[PDB]
Amino acid sequence: IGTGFPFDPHYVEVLGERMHYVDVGPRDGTPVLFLHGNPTSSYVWRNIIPHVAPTHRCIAPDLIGMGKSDKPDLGYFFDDHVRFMDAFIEALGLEEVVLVIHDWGSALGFHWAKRNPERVKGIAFMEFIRPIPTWDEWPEFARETFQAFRTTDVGRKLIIDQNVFIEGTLPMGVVRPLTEVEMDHYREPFLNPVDREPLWRFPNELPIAGEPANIVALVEEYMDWLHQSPVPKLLFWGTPGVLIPPAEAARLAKSLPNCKAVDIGPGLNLLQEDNPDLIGSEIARWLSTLEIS
Ligand SMILES: [Cl-]
């Protein structure tokens, strides 16, 4: 499992800010958009992208306030991420796309897809945002932690003061140890405690037990759309998972139209850190099947 990030930086001005992106692969076809979540960057994709780069254009942006994207004094609400990602897409001039999405990236991806259905030729997803209608349905071992995260007081002491999301939650969304080189990559954007607002806001935006209602409403909408959509779907899942337990992958595999679903073996949240070659290989393959009518 490679620790290197051998991608030349690309930058584009988005709403008076600068966002970073990985851009590789053929220039000609349908492009593949990789959207990371919390608390990652395009780094999370580094070992998935080389599987796809040979046949497809690979576009992997750092979300505003993350990776090497600019860090303006925002609240980094979901709605800000939407604003910025909507704009990024239009800046690159993208028309049809395929979406490869994860964690908060999935909420972006689904949300954009709901709004632009005639431009999504496929979606691959994994460990994605769905409504967790009670805290019962959140992983036992992570309840106390995400409960404290969802406080201004101590949540911020943890995430912003202490950097627990990065030093603690992150390694704990991966089954294998992360090396020190890998940790340092995940740490780089958030060395300055100032810049960790995204990391605290995101958990406070998770649609758990009805709140925040704005997020719940919105996630409910994209999931309802997803159930009424033919668009080809590819669902990676792990055991036991975090945001998606095995049992729920099972249910969605069945419930979502035209959806293929691939078990990746041991996995928590950052599936891409536990089995890159498998997800990479399966995406690439599946991509080819989208051209078979
Ligand atoms: Cl989060």
UniProtKB/Swiss-Prot annotation:
InterPro entries documented for this protein: AB_hydrolase_1, AB_hydrolase_fold, AB_hydrolase_sf, Epox_hydrolase-like, Haloalkane_dehalogenase_2
Annotated EC: 3.8.1.5
Cleavable signal peptide: none
Active site (record annotation): 103 (nucleophile), 127 (proton donor), 269 (proton acceptor)
MF annotations from Gene Ontology: haloalkane dehalogenase activity
Subunit structure and binding partners: Monomer.
GO biological process: response to toxic substance
Alphabetized UniProt keyword annotations: Detoxification, Hydrolase
Span of domain AB hydrolase-1: 31-155
A family per Pfam: Abhydrolase_1
Keyword Transport annotated: no
PANTHER family tied to this protein: CIS-3-ALKYL-4-ALKYLOXETAN-2-ONE DECARBOXYLASE, MONOACYLGLYCEROL LIPASE
GO cellular component, one term: membrane
Metabolic or biological pathway, per its Swiss-Prot or TrEMBL entry: Xenobiotic degradation; haloalkane degradation
Catalysed reactions, as listed in the record: 1-haloalkane + H2O = a halide anion + a primary alcohol + H(+)
Group of enzyme by EC: hydrolase
Its job: Catalyzes hydrolytic cleavage of carbon-halogen bonds in halogenated aliphatic compounds, leading to the formation of the corresponding primary alcohols, halide ions and protons.
Name by which UniProt lists this protein: Haloalkane dehalogenase
Native organism taxonomy: Bacteria, Bacillati, Actinomycetota, Actinomycetes, Mycobacteriales
